[PDB]
């Protein structure tokens with residue numbers, strides 16, 4: 001059994017590597033010791049677009065948001081491709097695959113955004129840029145407080161010092177949550193999650209021997225993830241209520 | 255590599271099933287009396303059309319408006335599916351919009367063929383079936399909307415594609431680097447090259463005794479273009495004649511420019 005959990009851990013890490021171009025290791029390397037272009041106020045953002053070839057650019061506050069929606073839609077596709085490698089996922093009922101992705105992408109998006117944040121800012125644009133936390137906060141209400149709860153989560157989450165090999169298994173666990181509303185067949189889902197939890201537990205024990213109950217502590221963060229998503233939806237229900245193009249709004253439904 | 259193209263074919267098929275609730279497989283089981291599905295109520299005339307409400311302006315306007323609601327829903331589905339085509343969401347955003355703007359019709363009339371035979375067309379997710387002759391008896395010019403779509407469907411349906419074939423083909427259609435106004439033609443053409451390569455292998459494996467089916471399928475892109483032009487010129491007549499009637503905003507933003 002233990003050899004099997006090592007094998008599963010290795011398979012997931014390989015898939016994560018093929019699926020996510022900017023890994024946590026690569027991001028920490030950029031945030032520590034080339035280097036990214038920095039956006040810290042209104043002036044460095046005008047320059048930042050000249051320089052960085054933004055794929056999302058057709059007012060300041062909404063334009064940064066739309067780019068966050070752009071990259072998030074890109075992230076969905078990366079997570080979806082990763083999910084397919086999780087053993088048993090593709091044998092699940094199709095509707096349930098869709099249901100698991102739909103309710104899980106937001107949680108995985110904020111998990112992986114933390115790999116790319118520190119207390120001072122967040123990498124953007126595949127790490128070519130770095131946008132400070134102060135400039136984000138300084139955005140007019142209600143735009144200057146959607147990334148702030150993200151940062152505060154990332155601070156605490158990053159203090160657990162997970163690497164990519166850890167996150168690969170953790171992300172699979174989130175996807176295989178048997179309590180998403182509207183699932184048809186919870187068995188194989190909760191069955192696969194049991195195997196993944198067993199592998200994450202062994203991974204954390206071998207990779208962080210001195211970090212007692214890191215397994216438990218990481219589980220406790222899934223609580224914080226659910227809380228942030230529900231609070232994010234509440235802001236999304238207002239950016240779709242305060243700020244008011246048909247084809248574009250169709251691409252960025254949800 | 256063939257193994258990689260097979261994986262692309264599987265990906266698109268799997269995403270196609272997730273995006274389009276009413277497949278060709280389900281439509282044919284409804285139209286050919288199979289017992290996996292149910293028989294449609296058939297609308298011929300004012301009398302059945304009126305019984306169709308109690309089972310599923312004026313007549314011709316009401317059919318047109320409902321057909322417009324359906325086009326909007328299809329545009330929503332085709333949008334979801336496009337985001338699944340690898341590389342699509344990584345393209346410049348203005349081009350994504352452009353690829354959907356010119357793409358959705360060619361795809362709509364492709365998938366509308368799945369819902370047709372020579373005698374009429376499934377409606378309301380297959381619960382209903384409206385005849386080709388009733389659609390032509392509609393007053394001018396609403397009676398001319400549907401007939402060219404029937405003529406294409408009859409020829410297109412003789413290729414005998416199933417949903418796995420269609421999924422790659424509609425992907426090829428979205429990723430056309432000759433759409434007007436595109437900014438970065440090259441990355442769009444790089445993706446279509448893989449899509450075309452995947453469709454080629456898919457057609458050879460799924461239809462091994464169907465020679466030049468790949469060529470024959472690319473050739474229908476000609477018939478698709480003509481349907482769109484005709485359809486647009488027909489919508490311009492109603493815009494000048496029924497100044498009380500409104501096009502849905504998603505639809506009007508597609509036809510603009």
Ligand SMILES: Cc1ccc(COc2cccc(CNc3nnn[nH]3)c2)cc1
Pocket residue numbers: 064065067068071072075108109110112113116122123124125126
């Ligand atoms: C792994 C991952 C998942 C989701 C997201 C999506 O979340 C964000 C938030 C802030 C900036 C960016 C980068 N792109 C951008 N946004 N604004 N300008 N460039 C993305 C990023 C990574």
Ligand SMILES: Cc1ccc(COc2cccc(CNc3nnn[nH]3)c2)cc1
Pocket residue numbers: 317320321322324325362366375376377378399400
């Ligand atoms: C409930 C209902 C469903 C379908 C129809 C009509 O059948 C369809 C079905 C799908 C696409 C199109 C597009 N064809 C078109 N667009 N504008 N004019 N013709 C026509 C009428 C009522």
